[PDB]
Short mmCIF file of C-alpha atoms and ligand atoms in Angstrom, two decimals:
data_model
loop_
_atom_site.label_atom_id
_atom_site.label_comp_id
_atom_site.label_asym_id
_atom_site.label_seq_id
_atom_site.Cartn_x
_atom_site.Cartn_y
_atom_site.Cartn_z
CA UNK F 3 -101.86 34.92 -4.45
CA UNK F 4 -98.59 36.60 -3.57
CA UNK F 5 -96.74 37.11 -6.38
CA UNK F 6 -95.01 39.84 -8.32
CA UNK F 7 -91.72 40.37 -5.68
CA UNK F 8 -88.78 37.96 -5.02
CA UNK F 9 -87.12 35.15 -2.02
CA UNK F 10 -83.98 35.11 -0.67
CA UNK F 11 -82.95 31.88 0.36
CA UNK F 12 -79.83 32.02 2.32
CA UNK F 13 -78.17 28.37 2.26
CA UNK F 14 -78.24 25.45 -0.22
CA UNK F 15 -78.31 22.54 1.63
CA UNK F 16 -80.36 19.92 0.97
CA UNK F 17 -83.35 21.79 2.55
CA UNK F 18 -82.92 25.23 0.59
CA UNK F 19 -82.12 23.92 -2.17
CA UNK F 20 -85.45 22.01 -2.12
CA UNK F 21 -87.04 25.34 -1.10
CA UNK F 22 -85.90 26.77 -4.10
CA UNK F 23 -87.65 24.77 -6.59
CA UNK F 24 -90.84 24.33 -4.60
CA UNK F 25 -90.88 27.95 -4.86
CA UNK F 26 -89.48 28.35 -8.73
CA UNK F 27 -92.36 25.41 -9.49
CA UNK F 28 -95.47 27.86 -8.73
CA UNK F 29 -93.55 30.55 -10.07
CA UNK F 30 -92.24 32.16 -7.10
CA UNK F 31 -88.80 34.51 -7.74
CA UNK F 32 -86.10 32.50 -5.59
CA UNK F 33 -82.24 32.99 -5.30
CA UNK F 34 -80.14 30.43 -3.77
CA UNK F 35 -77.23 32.39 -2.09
CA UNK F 36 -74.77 29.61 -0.80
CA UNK F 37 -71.43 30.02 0.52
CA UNK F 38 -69.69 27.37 -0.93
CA UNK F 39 -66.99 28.16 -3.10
CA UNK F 40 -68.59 26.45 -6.18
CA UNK F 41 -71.01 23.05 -6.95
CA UNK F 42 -68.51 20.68 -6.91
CA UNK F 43 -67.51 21.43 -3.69
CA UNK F 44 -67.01 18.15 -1.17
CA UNK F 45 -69.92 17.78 1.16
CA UNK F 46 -68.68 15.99 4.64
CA UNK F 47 -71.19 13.52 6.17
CA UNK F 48 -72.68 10.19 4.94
CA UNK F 49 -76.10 9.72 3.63
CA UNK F 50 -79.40 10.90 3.65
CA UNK F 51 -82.69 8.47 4.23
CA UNK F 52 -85.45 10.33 2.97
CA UNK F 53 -88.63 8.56 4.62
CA UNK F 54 -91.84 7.76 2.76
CA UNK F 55 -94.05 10.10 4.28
CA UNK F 56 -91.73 13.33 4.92
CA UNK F 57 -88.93 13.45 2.63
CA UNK F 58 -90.03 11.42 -0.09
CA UNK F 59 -92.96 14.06 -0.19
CA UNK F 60 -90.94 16.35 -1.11
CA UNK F 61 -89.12 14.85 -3.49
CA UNK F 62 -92.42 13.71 -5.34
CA UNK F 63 -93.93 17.07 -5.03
CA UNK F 64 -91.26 18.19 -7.05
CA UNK F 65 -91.15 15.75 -9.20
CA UNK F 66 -87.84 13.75 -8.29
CA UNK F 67 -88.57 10.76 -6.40
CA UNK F 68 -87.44 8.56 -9.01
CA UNK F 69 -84.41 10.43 -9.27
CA UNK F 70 -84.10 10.09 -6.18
CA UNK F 71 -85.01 5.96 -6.21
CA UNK F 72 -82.59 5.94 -8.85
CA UNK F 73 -79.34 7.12 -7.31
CA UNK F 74 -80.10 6.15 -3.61
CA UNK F 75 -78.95 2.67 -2.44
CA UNK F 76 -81.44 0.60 0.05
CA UNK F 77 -79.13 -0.79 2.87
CA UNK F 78 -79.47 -3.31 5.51
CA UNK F 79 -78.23 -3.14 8.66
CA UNK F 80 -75.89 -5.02 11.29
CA UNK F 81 -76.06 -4.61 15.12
CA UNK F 82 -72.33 -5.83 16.05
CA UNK F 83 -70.70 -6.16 19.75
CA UNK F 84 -67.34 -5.05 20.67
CA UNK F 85 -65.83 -8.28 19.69
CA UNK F 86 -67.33 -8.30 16.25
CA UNK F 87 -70.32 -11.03 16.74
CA UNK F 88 -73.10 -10.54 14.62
CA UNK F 89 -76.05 -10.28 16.96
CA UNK F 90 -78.97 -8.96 14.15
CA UNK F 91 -78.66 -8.59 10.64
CA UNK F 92 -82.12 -6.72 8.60
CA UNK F 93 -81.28 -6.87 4.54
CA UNK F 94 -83.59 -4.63 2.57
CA UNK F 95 -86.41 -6.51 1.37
CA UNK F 96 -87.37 -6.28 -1.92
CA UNK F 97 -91.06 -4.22 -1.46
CA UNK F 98 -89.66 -2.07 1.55
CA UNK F 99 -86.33 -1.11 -0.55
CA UNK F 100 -88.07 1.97 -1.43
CA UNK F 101 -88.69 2.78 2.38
CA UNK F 102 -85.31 4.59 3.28
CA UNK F 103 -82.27 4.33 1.12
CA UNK F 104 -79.42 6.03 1.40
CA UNK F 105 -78.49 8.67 -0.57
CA UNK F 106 -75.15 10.32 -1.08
CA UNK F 107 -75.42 14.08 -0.08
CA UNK F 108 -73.65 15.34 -2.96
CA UNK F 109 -76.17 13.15 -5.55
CA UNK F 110 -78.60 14.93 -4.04
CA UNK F 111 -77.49 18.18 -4.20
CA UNK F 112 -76.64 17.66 -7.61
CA UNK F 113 -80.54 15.96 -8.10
CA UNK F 114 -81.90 19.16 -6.65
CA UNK F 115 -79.44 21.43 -8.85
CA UNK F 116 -80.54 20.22 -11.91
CA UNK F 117 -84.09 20.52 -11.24
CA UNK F 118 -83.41 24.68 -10.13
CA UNK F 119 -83.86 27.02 -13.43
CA UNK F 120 -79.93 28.01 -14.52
CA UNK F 121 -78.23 30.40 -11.95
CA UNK F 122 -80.91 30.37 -9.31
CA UNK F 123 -77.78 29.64 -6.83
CA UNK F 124 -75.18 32.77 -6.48
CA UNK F 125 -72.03 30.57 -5.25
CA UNK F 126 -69.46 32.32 -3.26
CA UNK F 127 -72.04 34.39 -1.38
CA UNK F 128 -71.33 34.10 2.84
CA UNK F 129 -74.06 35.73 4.16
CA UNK F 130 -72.45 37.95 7.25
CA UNK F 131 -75.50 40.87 7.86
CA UNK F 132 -78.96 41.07 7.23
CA UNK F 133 -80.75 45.11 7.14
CA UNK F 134 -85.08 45.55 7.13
CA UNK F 135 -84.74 48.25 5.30
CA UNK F 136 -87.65 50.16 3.85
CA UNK F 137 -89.86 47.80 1.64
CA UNK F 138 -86.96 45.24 1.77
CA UNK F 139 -84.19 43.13 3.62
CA UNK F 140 -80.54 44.61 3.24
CA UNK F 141 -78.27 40.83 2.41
CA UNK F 142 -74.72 41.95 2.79
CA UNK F 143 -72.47 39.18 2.07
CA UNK F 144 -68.60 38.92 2.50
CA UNK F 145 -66.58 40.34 -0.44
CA UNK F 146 -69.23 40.76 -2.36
CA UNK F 147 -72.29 42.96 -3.91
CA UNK F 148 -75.12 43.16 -1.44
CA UNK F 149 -78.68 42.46 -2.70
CA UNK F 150 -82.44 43.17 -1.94
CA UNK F 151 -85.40 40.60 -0.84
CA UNK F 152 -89.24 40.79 0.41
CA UNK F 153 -88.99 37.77 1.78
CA UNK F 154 -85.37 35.67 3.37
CA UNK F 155 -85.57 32.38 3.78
CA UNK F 156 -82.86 31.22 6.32
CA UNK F 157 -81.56 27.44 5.59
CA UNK F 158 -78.01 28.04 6.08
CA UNK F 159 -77.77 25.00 8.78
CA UNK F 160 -77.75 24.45 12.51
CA UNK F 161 -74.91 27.03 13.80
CA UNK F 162 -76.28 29.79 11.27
CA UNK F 163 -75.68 33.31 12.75
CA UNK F 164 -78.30 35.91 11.44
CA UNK F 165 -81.33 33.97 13.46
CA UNK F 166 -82.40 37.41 15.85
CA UNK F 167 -84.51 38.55 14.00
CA UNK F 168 -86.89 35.80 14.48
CA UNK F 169 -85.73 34.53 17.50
CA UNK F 170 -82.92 35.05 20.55
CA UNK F 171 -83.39 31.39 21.09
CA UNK F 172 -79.25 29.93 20.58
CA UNK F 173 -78.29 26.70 19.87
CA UNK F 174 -77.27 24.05 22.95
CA UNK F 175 -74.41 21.74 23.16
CA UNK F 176 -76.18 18.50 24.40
CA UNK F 177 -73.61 16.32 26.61
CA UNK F 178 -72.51 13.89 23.65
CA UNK F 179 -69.87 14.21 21.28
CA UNK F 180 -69.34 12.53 17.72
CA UNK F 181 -66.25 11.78 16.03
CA UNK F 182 -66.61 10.85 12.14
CA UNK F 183 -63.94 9.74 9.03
CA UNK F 184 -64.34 8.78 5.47
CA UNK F 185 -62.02 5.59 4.45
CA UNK F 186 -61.00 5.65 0.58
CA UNK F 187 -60.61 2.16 -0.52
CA UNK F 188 -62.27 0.68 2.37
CA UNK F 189 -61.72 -2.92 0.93
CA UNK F 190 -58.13 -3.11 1.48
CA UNK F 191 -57.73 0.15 4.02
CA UNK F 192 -60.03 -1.26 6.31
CA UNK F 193 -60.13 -4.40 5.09
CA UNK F 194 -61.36 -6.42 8.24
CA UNK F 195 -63.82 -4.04 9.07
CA UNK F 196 -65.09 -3.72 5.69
CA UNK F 197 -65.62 -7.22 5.67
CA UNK F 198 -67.26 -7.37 9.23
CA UNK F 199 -70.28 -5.01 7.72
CA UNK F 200 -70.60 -7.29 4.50
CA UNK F 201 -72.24 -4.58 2.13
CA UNK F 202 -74.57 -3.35 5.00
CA UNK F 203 -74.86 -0.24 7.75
CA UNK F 204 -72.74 -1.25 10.93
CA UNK F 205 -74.23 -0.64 14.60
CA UNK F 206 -72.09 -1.28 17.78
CA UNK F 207 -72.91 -0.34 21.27
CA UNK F 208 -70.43 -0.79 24.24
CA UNK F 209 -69.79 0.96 27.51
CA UNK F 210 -71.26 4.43 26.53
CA UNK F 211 -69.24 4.74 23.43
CA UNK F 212 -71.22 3.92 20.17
CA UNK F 213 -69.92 2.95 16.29
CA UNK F 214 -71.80 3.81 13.11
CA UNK F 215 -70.55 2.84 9.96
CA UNK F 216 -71.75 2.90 6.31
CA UNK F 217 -69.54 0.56 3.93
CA UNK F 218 -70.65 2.09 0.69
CA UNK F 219 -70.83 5.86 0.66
CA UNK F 220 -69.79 6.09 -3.06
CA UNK F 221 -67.25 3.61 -2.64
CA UNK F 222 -66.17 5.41 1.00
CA UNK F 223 -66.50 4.34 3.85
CA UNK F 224 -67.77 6.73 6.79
CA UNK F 225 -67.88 5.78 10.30
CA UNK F 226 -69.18 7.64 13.45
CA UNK F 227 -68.00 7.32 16.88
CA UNK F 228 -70.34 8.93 19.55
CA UNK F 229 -70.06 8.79 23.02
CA UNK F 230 -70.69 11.28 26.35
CA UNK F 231 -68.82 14.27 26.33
CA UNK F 232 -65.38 13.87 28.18
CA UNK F 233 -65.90 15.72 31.66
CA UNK F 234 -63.01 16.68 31.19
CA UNK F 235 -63.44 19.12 28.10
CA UNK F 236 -64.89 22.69 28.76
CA UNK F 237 -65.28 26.33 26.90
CA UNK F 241 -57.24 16.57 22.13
CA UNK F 242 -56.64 18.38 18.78
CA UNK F 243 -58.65 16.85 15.62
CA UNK F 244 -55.41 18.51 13.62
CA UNK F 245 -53.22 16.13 14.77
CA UNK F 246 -54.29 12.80 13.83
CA UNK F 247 -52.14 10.24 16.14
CA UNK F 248 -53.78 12.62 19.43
CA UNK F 249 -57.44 11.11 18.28
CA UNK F 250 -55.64 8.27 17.26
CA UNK F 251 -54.47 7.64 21.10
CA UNK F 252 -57.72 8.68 22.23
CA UNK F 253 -59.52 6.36 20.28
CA UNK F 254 -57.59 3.58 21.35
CA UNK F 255 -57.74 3.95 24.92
CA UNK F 256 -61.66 4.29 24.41
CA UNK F 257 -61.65 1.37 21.82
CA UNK F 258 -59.12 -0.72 24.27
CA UNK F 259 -61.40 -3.13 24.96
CA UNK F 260 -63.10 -3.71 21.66
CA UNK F 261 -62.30 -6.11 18.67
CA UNK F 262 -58.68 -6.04 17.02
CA UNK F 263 -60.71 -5.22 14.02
CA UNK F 264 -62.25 -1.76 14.98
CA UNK F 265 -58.93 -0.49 16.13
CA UNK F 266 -57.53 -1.49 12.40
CA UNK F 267 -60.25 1.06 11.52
CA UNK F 268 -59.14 3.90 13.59
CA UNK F 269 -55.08 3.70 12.89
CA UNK F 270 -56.38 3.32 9.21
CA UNK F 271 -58.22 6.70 9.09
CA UNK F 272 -56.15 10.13 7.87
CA UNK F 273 -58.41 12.67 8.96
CA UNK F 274 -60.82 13.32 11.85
CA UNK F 275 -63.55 15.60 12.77
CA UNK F 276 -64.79 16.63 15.68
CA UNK F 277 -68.26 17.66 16.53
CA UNK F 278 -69.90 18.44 19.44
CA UNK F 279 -73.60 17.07 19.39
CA UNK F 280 -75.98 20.49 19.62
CA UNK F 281 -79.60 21.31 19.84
CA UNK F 282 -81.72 24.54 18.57
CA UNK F 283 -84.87 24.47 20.63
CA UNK F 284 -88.71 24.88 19.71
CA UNK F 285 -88.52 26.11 23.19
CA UNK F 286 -89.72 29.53 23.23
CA UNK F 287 -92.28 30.57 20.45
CA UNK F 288 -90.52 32.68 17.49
CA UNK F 289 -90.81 36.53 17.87
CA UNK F 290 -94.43 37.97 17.36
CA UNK F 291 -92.68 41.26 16.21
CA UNK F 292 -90.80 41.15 13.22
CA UNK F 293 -89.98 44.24 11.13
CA UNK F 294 -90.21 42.37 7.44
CA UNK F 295 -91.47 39.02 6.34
CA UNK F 296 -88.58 36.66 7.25
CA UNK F 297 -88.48 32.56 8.38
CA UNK F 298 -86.65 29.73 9.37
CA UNK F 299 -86.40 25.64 7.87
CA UNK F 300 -84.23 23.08 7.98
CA UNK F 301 -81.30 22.69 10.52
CA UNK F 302 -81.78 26.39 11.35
CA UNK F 303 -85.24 26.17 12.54
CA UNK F 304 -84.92 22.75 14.16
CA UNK F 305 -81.06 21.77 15.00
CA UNK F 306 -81.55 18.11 16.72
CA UNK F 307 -79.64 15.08 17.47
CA UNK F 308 -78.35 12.74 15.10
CA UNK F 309 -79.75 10.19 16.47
CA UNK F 310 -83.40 9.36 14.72
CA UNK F 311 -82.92 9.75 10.93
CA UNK F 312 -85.03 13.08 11.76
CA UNK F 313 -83.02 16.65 9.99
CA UNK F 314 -83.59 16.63 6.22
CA UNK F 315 -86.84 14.74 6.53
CA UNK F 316 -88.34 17.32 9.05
CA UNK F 317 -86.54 20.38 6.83
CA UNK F 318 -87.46 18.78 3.74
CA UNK F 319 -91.17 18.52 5.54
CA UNK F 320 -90.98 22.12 6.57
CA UNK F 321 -89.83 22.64 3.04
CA UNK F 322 -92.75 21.04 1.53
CA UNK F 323 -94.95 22.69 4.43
CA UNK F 324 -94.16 26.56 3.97
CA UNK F 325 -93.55 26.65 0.10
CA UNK F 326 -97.31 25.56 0.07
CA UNK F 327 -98.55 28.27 1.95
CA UNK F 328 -97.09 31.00 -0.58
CA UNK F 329 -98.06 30.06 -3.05
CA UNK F 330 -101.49 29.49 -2.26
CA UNK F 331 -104.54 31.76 -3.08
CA UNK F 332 -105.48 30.15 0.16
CA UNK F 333 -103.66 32.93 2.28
CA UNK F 334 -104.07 36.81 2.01
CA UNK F 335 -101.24 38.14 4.33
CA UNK F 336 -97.41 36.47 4.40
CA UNK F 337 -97.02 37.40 8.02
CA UNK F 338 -99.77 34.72 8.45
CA UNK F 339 -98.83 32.50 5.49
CA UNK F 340 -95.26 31.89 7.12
CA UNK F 341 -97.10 32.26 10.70
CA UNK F 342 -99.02 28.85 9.91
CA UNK F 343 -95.90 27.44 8.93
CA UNK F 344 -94.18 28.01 11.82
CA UNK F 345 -97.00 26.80 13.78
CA UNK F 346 -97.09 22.85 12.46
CA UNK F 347 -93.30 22.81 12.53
CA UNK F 348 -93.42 23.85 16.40
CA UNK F 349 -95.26 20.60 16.30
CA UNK F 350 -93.27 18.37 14.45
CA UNK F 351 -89.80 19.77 15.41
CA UNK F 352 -90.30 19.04 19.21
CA UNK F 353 -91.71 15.75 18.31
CA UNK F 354 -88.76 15.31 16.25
CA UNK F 355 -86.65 16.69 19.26
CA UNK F 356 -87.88 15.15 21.84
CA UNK F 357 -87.36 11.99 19.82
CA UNK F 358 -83.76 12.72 19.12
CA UNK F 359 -83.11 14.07 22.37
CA UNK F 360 -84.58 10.15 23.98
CA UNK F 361 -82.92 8.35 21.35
CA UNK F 362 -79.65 9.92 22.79
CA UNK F 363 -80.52 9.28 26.43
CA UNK F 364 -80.96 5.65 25.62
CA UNK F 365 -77.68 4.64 23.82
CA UNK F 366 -74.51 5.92 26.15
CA UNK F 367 -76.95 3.85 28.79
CA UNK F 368 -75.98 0.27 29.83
CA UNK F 369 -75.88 -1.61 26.37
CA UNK F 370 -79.09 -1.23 24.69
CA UNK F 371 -80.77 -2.78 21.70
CA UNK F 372 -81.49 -0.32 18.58
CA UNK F 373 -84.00 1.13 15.99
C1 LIG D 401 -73.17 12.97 12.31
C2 LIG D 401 -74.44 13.44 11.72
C3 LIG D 401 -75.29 12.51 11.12
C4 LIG D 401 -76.51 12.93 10.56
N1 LIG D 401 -77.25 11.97 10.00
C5 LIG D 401 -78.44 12.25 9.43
C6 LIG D 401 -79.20 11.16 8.83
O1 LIG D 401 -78.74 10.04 8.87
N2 LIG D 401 -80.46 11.44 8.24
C7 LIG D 401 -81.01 12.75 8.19
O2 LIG D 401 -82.13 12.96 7.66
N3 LIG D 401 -80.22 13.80 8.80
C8 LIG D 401 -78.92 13.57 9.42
N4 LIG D 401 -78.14 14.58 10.01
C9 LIG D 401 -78.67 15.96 9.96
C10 LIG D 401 -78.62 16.62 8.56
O3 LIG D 401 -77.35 16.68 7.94
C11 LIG D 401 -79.28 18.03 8.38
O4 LIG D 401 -80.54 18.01 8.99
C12 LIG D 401 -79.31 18.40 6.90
O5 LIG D 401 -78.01 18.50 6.44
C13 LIG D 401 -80.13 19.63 6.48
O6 LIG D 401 -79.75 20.93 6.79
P1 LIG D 401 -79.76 22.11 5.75
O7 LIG D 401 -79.52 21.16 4.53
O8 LIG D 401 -81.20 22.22 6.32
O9 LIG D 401 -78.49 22.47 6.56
P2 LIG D 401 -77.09 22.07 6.02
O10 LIG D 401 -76.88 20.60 5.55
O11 LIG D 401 -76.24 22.32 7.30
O12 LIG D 401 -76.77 23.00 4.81
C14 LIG D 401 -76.54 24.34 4.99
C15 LIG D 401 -76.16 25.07 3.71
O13 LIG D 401 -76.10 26.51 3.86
C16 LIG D 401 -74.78 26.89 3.67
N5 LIG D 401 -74.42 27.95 4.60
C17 LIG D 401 -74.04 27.81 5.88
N6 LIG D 401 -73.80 29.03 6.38
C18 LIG D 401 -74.02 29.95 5.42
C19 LIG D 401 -73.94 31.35 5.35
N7 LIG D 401 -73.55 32.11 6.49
N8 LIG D 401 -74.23 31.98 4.21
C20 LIG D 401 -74.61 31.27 3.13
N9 LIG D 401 -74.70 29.91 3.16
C21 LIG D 401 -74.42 29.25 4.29
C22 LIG D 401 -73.97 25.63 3.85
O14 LIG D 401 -72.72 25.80 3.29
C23 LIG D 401 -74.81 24.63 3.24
O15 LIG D 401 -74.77 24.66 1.86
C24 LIG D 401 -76.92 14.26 10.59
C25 LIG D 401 -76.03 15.18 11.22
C26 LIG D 401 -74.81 14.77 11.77
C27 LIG D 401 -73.89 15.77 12.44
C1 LIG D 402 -81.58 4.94 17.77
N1 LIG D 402 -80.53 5.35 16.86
C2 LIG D 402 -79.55 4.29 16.84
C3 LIG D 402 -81.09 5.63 15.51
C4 LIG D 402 -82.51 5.47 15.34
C5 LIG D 402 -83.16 5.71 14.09
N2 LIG D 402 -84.64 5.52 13.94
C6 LIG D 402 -85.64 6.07 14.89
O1 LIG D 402 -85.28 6.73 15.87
C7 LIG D 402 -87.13 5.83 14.63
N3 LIG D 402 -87.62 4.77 15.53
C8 LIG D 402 -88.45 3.76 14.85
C9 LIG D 402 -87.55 2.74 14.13
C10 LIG D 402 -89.37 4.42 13.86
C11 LIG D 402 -89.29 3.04 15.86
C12 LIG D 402 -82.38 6.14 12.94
O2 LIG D 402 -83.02 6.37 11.70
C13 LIG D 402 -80.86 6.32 13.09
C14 LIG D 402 -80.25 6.10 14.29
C15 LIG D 402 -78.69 6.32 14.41
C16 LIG D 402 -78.05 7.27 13.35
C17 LIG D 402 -76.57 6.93 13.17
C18 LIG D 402 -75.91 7.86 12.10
C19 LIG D 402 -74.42 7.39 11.80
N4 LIG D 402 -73.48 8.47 12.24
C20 LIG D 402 -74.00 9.43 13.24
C21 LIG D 402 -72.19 7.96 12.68
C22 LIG D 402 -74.08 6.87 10.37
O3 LIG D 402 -72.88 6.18 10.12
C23 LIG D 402 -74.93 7.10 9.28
C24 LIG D 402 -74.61 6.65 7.87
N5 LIG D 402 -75.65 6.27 6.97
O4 LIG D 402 -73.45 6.66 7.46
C25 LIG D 402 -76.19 7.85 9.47
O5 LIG D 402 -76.87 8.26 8.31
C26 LIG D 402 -76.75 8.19 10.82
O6 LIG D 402 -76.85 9.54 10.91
C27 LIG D 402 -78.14 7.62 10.90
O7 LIG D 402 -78.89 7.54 9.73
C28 LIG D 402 -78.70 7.22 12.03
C29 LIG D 402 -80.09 6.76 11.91
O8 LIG D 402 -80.68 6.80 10.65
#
């Protein structure tokens, strides 16, 4: 059942995206309306683990788990201490390879592109207003043509802006903060440090601050420094590069000569603040057309326990099943029991992410 009208899926992350062809599979009408400025556009961050179980799901029920097998890379992982002793090292072993490895967000946006029917993603389309008009949603997007939907699906990330109509709920800050780079050339940029990870994920833990690194993001290397919110910071400049330099160093003081090679090696910084969207408060009972939520959108979280494309690619697989099934008669209850399991898995996921974070930043700890 429930055919015959068409989806609006605003945001083509790795969780629309997947929406998209879940939907276009059963023969559901889906556009893709993503703000970027074109495909090839960069995508900041490292790399996605899709777990057997929840992501991989989705990626089999689509049929591109072996796509994605083939272009993820199975890491291992280092636990190092701020003068760079190796205290743990787990290599992937050669039956659990196919567990969690890492994929590059770009592959897999270009994975999940090629499976979507030509032009099912409308590039250049910022989403700024959403109407209920009569039978249909009103899209307005920013310097350009406005379109009409039955259904919108939002997936345009954690901070996304047109969320009232389902719920009032607004995203958190949490009390951490995370500072992340990409390294071209990390063999001879970062040459110490690239050597210190030796092909695997990096882990360090000391004092409150914590360092993540991956040593082969397509050849890049992207590191993450996380640590409790300065007290200090309320309502540096990640601009100007020797500012978060400085910083850096005065929090790194203590560590290894050959993290600090890291930092004065890196060009550009970003700054985010760690933030939370939560399953607090049940969505709205009363909505005036059929509209829903996946992916960072419906469940913002910590980055902290490999949990945000997993549980959106979940609530992906989740939610495209109950539209297209003969099994459900009215859409207000056929995204209704969607939103019910996520409220389930989300907080899980949540209240995971939201532990994970209490237990690193306290007195040196041990990892997961
Ligand atoms: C430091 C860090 C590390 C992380 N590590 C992991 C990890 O290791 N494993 C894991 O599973 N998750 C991780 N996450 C979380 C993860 O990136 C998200 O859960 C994931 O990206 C999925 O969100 P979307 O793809 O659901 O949202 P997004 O990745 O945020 O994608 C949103 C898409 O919608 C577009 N968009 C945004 N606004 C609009 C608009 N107004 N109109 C139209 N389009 C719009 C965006 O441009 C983008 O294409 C991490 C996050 C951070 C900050
Ligand atoms: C407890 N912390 C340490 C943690 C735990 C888990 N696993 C669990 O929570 C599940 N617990 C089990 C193991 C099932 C018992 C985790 O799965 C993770 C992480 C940490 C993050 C670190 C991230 C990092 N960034 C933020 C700087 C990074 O460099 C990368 C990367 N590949 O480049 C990440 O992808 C990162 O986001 C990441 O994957 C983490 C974890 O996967």
């Amino acid at each position: 059942l429930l055919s015959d009208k068409n989806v609006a899926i605003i945001g083509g992350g790795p969780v629309g995206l997947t929406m998209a062809k879940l939907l276009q599979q059963n023969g559901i009408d889906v556009s893709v309306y993503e703000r970027d400025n074109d495909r090839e556009a960069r995508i900041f961050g490292g790399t996605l683990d899709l777990h057997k179980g929840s992501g991989q799901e989705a990626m089999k029920k689509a049929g591109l788990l072996q796509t994605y097998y083939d272009l993820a890379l199975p890491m291992g992982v280092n636990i190092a201490d701020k003068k760079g002793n190796i205290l743990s090292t787990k290599n992937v072993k050669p039956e659990n390879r196919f567990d969690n490895p890492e994929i590059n967000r770009n592959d897999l946006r270009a994975i999940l592109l090629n499976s979507l029917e030509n032009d099912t993603v409308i590039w250049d389309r910022k989403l700024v207003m959403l109407e209920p008009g009569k039978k249909k949603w009103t899209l307005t997007f920013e310097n350009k043509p406005s379109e009409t939907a039955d259904l919108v699906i939002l997936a345009n990330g954690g901070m996304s802006k047109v969320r009232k109509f389902v719920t009032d709920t607004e995203v958190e800050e949490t009390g951490t903060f995370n500072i992340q780079a990409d390294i071209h050339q990390p063999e001879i940029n970062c040459p110490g440090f690239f050597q210190l990870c030796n092909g695997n994920r990096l882990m360090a833990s000391h004092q409150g601050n914590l360092l993540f690194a991956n040593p082969n993001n397509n050849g890049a290397l992207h590191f993450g420094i996380s640590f409790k919110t300065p007290d200090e910071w309320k309502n540096v400049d990640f601009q100007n590069r020797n500012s978060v330099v400085d910083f850096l160093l005065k929090k790194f003081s203590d560590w290894d000569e050959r993290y600090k090679e890291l930092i004065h090696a890196t060009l550009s910084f970003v700054g985010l603040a760690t933030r939370i969207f939560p399953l607090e408060k049940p969505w709205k009972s009363k909505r005036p057309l059929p509209i829903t939520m996946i992916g960072d959108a419906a469940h913002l979280m910590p980055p902290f326990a490999g949990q945000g494309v997993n549980s959106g690619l979940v609530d992906a697989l989740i939610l495209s099943d109950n539209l297209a099934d003969g099994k459900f008669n009215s859409i207000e209850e056929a995204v209704k029991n969607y939103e019910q399991q996520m409220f389930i898995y989300g907080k899980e996921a949540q209240e995971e992410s939201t532990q994970n974070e209490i237990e690193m930043f306290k007195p040196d700890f041990t990892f997961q």
